[PDB]
Amino acid sequence: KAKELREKSVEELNTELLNLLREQFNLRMQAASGQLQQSHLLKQVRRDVARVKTLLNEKAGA
Amino acid sequence: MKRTFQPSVLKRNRSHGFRARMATKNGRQVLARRRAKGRARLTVSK
Amino acid sequence: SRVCQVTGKRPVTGNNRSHALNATKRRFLPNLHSHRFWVESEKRFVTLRVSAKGMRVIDKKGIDTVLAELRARGEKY
Amino acid sequence: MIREERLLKVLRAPHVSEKASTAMEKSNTIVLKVAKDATKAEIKAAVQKLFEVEVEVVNTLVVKGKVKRHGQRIGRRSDWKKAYVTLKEGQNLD
Amino acid sequence: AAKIRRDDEVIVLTGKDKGKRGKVKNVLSSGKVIVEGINLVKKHQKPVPALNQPGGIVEKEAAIQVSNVAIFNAATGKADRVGFRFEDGKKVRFFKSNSETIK
RNA sequence: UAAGGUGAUAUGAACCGUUAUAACCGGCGAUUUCCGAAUGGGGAAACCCAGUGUGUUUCGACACACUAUCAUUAACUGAAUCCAUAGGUUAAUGAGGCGAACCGGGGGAACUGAAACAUCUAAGUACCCCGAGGAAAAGAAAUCAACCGAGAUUCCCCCAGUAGCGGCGAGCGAACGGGGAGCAGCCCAGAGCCUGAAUCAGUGUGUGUGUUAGUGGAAGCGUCUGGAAAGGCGCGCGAUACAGGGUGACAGCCCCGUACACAAAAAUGCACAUGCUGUGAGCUCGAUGAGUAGGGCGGGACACGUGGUAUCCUGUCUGAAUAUGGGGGGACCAUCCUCCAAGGCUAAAUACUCCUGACUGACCGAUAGUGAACCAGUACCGUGAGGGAAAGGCGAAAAGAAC
RNA sequence: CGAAGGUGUGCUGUGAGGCAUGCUGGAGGUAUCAGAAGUGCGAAUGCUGACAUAAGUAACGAUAAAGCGGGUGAAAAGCCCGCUCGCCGGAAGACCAAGGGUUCCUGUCCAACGUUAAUCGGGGCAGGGUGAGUCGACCCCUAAGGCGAGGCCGAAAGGCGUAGUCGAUGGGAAACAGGUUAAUAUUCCUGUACUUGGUGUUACUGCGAAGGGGGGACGGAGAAGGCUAUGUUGGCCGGGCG
RNA sequence: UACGGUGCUGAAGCAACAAAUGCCCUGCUUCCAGGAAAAGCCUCUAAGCAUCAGGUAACAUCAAAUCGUACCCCAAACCGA
Numbered sequence A: 001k002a003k004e005l006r007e008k009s010v011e012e013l014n015t016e017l018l019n020l021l022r023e024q025f026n027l028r029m030q031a032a033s034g035q036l037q038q039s040h041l042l043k044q045v046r047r048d049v050a051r052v053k054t055l056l057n058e059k060a061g062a
Numbered sequence B: 001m002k003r004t005f006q007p008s009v010l011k012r013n014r015s016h017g018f019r020a021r022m023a024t025k026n027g028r029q030v031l032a033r034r035r036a037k038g039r040a041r042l043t044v045s046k
Numbered sequence C: 001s002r003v004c005q006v007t008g009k010r011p012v013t014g015n016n017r018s019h020a021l022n023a024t025k026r027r028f029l030p031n032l033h034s035h036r037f038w039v040e041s042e043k044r045f046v047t048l049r050v051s052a053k054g055m056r057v058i059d060k061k062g063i064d065t066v067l068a069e070l071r072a073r074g075e076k077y
Numbered sequence D: 001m002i003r004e005e006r007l008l009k010v011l012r013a014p015h016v017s018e019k020a021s022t023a024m025e026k027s028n029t030i031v032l033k034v035a036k037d038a039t040k041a042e043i044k045a046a047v048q049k050l051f052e053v054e055v056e057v058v059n060t061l062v063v064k065g066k067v068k069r070h071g072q073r074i075g076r077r078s079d080w081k082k083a084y085v086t087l088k089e090g091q092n093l094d
Numbered sequence E: 001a002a003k004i005r006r007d008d009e010v011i012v013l014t015g016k017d018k019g020k021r022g023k024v025k026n027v028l029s030s031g032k033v034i035v036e037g038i039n040l041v042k043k044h045q046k047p048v049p050a051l052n053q054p055g056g057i058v059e060k061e062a063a064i065q066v067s068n069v070a071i072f073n074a075a076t077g078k079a080d081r082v083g084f085r086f087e088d089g090k091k092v093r094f095f096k097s098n099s100e101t102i103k
Numbered sequence F: 001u002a003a004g005g006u007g008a009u010a011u012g013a014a015c016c017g018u019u020a021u022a023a024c025c026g027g028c029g030a031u032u033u034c035c036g037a038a039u040g041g042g043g044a045a046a047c048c049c050a051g052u053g054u055g056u057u058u059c060g061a062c063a064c065a066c067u068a069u070c071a072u073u074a075a076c077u078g079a080a081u082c083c084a085u086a087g088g089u090u091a092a093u094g095a096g097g098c099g100a101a102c103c104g105g106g107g108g109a110a111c112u113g114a115a116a117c118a119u120c121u122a123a124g125u126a127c128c129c130c131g132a133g134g135a136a137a138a139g140a141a142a143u144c145a146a147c148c149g150a151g152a153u154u155c156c157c158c159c160a161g162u163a164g165c166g167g168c169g170a171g172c173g174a175a176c177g178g179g180g181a182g183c184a185g186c187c188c189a190g191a192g193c194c195u196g197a198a199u200c201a202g203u204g205u206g207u208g209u210g211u212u213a214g215u216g217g218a219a220g221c222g223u224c225u226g227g228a229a230a231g232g233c234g235c236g237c238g239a240u241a242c243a244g245g246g247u248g249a250c251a252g253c254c255c256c257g258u259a260c261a262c263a264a265a266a267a268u269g270c271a272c273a274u275g276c277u278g279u280g281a282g283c284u285c286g287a288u289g290a291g292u293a294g295g296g297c298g299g300g301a302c303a304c305g306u307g308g309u310a311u312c313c314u315g316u317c318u319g320a321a322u323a324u325g326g327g328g329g330g331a332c333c334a335u336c337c338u339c340c341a342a343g344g345c346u347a348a349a350u351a352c353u354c355c356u357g358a359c360u361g362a363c364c365g366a367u368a369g370u371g372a373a374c375c376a377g378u379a380c381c382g383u384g385a386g387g388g389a390a391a392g393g394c395g396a397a398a399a400g401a402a403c
Numbered sequence G: 001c002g003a004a005g006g007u008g009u010g011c012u013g014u015g016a017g018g019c020a021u022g023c024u025g026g027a028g029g030u031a032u033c034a035g036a037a038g039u040g041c042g043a044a045u046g047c048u049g050a051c052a053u054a055a056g057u058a059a060c061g062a063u064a065a066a067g068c069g070g071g072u073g074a075a076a077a078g079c080c081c082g083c084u085c086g087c088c089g090g091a092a093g094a095c096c097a098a099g100g101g102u103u104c105c106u107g108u109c110c111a112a113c114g115u116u117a118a119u120c121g122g123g124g125c126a127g128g129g130u131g132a133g134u135c136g137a138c139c140c141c142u143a144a145g146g147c148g149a150g151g152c153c154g155a156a157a158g159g160c161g162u163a164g165u166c167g168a169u170g171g172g173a174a175a176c177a178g179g180u181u182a183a184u185a186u187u188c189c190u191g192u193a194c195u196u197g198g199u200g201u202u203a204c205u206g207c208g209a210a211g212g213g214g215g216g217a218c219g220g221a222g223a224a225g226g227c228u229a230u231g232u233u234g235g236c237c238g239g240g241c242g
Numbered sequence H: 001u002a003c004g005g006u007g008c009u010g011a012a013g014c015a016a017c018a019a020a021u022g023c024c025c026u027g028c029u030u031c032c033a034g035g036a037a038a039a040g041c042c043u044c045u046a047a048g049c050a051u052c053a054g055g056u057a058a059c060a061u062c063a064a065a066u067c068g069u070a071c072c073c074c075a076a077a078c079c080g081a
Helices: A001-007 A008-030 A040-059 B009-018 B018-023 B024-039 C050-062 C063-073 D004-010 D016-025 D041-049
Strands: C012-016 C024-029 C033-038 C044-051 D013-014 D029-034 D055-064 D066-069 D071-077 D082-087 E009-012 E020-030 E030-033 E040-044 E057-061 E069-073 E082-086 E091-095
Touching: A008 A040, A008 D013, A040 E091, B009 B018, B009 D041, B018 B024, C012 D029, C024 D016, C033 C050, C033 C063, C044 C050, C050 C063, D004 D013, D013 D041, D013 E009, D016 D029, D041 D055, D041 D082, E069 E091
Parallel strands: none
Antiparallel strands: C012 C024, C033 C044, D013 D029, D029 D082, D055 D082, D066 D071, E009 E020, E009 E069, E020 E030, E040 E057, E082 E091
8 A cells, every 4th residue: 555655745644644543443442342353454454554654754854 | 497598679689689780890790691691580680 | 000100100010039939929119209390381380190210201301291291191180 | 632643552442341340330430451551641531532431530550460371381461451430420431 | 486386287196196186276385285186084073062063074185295296288198397487578387298388 | 586375382263365566585774662881860670750942732731852971172161369270061073881712911820740848830821800803913123143144023844852941850941944834015203305106094986706585407107016116127218417305115307406507676795997085105315212222129031940141021229322323143351243222004824713604524313412402591499609400203194083 | 025123932153142033113224345433331339210129118297176967079077058066365366567479259170289088279271350649659858878970099800988879777748437349448439538739810029049047856764644445334225034 | 039148227326434555745754874867847048030020818720640459478378398
């Protein structure tokens, strides 16, 4: 997804990151209960977040 | 019968703990030696 | 530390030999002395822990020169 | 003022147990697993934002990890922070 | 640069199922393949209440060494060896005997 | 580079991926909690407590940066005290700590031997301390030699267990000279002319060649025994590849490789080539290292134990000449010969292996080999420094024994 | 078509030994003549492991003591329940510090551990459990003492020490009663309290420290007097009529 | 009534006497051997600031973080294998 997310603004990125974080939180909440029967999702979300962070760093002073 | 070891944590730490070891040159040397050996517990420190 | 500031004379080790040649370790300390030296240029006394040899050297050369040398060496006075 | 991002990270899970259940039912108090670094205020903030529910007070405690033995090898479970969060009267939590 | 792959029909050079043929089912990182119908073992499957397994003498396909199988060339009617070569900026396998590309 | 993947004990679950952002491998980046030199202050290491400033706030608070010490230089400030200096506050630069051995320096034992023991030996060893480098140190004759000559240092073989030293005991033990490895010479004590002239370091660029992923890489079938063939017996083929490892028993031709031939977007080592910054070459005139050389007293080093003892170093007290001069040639003198101390720099041959890769072994094969083939510096023991084990093998394949 | 190794047998050599072969074993061995040695073990109060002997012997860890009924169970002297009995009671009870670090509670299991059995356990496995403005630490302050910028001293390492900064075992703000869990409670809940900080206020109007002063701030023994904790008796209230 | 317990309910709830080694008492009396420190706390001003801040006054609001809290603790859990 990085090539797609690279074509964005800083503000845009930040919002996306926030959203991702929220999603992750939700997953965690679900995971703890017996709701989440799709574990890979959590793995994905974290990765996405990381990618976003990396992108942000690249943008701001690199 | 009052046996020799009469534990006290603070006393132990002050005596033998990491910071004490650091404080002196000989202590430092000891630490270094331990490291070289491969000790898991470098000091008395928990 | 017993070190002439002008000359650099430290203590050196050696032996006491007895009449039966019994070596025993000893030191040879330098003949140090703290002496106020008048510095004519700056118009003040500079105290220096110096050997008698150091003093002699100073006399020979001029205190100023000695001071300069010391400075060059990175030594406070 | 706690950062949104920080808040999201704070709260680890709901804690299911008899005691917890009792707390929920009788005293209107939810029992959460939270980050070990998460202070009380932060936790409260997280609760308010992320569950949308007024908080009366948060009590925290640190649970020490049990030492176990997997076959011959000894090994310790992690410490973790439990939080009893008391919700205001009439606050029903999903 | 792996000469045998998932969906290749192979012939067995050695063992109890030597001479027989079968499609490779899957290939393992250990340097062994599992081929369809070839190396069979009658495992005694231990029942478990969970996962809906009844438990019985199940005849399943054990692995075989990749070295023990060979890619079969349909044209020659025989086992062959595989070579590698670049056709149109892309690496492809070919039968050593007859020099034709694997497709 | 790919058709398979999501490290291991260790399956499963939920998934991703298959001609190219799945996974894997390599370059350059990003992230990099806390403790630790630990450096904002403190501290019972992985914890406690700040200050200042810049931004934000839903005004409850957040965030993130900086704040050690010393050295050096600079700026401002500044006592007794007039000027000054000490001191003080900032700023910049560097240092600090760790690390196997080797290296140089500062200190420095004893057991032991002498069939006792004190000189002597062990030994400038062990050990402690400081400092450095990929090597270090040494180094460009005030050196040897012998009236012939050699031509800085270092290292190897001789010289030679010689000459010597030595309670002339135990022991210690050269040099000259010869054969080799490698070889390199320069600058300042200073000013004149000429002005960018050799060389060196940092730093870009270019070329060559490595290194850090990789790619291709030959040729075998039948039959007998057998659980299985790579074995037997037949008949073939490859070989710049019969190194090695695996594969159901021993395989050149089944697999991985091997010989051989190729490969780098990116980073980077070493050679030369070249630009820029600093550095000054050649010429003439000189100048030619003083509390120094020597000496006395005391020690130490020289194979050399004070001896008839040259030479070097110096704790102590002295103290020249200064090239028409001075040093040395093993007491000392005379003659001759030979060199120019009291300022520096300097590659190579030499020393070592914590570590990386490749290959080898009349080396070990589980009481051996590392203490450690195994989750070992672990368990366990000890207040602590510290000590410190035992423990490998089902099968070809779990087909690990349903009922 | 069975290597080494293991184990029998037969033959053979003057001996160390050798050859052959049955069984076991399941993959290596190696003639000859040379070469090199970690080359031969019964002893070393040798070292390591294994296994004997004494011997089914001594002992089973305070002479506070048991008995029976029922339960569960494969099985009960030992576990659970009950009724008796006995022991401690300035402790063998209750609550802490130190030290330990999950031993707490529940379910479950009995190989090993428990000096016997064990259904039980401080044993195995799984899950649960520790809630603070006022308790303690942290924090502010210091003692003995430690470290210590500069500094003085010292071959080096380092020693001593000023300013300072650490250091409790001492000084420094504040909470009680009841109820509750299988397991926490001055921490949860119920009631009723207190503290010292900010911030904002209106009201007022001398505030301000690295300094001054007070205070904090203190020994042994003795003697009482006033009290309460607490206990006894009566009253009261509930129950009883053997 | 899952024989563990849970829910409701609830009388009197006084007096006298005795009484600590506990409290008043960091007191008092006495003795010689002559009995921590520093902060919190109260107070005084200096430099300062000056009609601002700061101080005390009540009242409102916010605040009190962090770590410990199980269990044993004269012992079968600590020091003695």
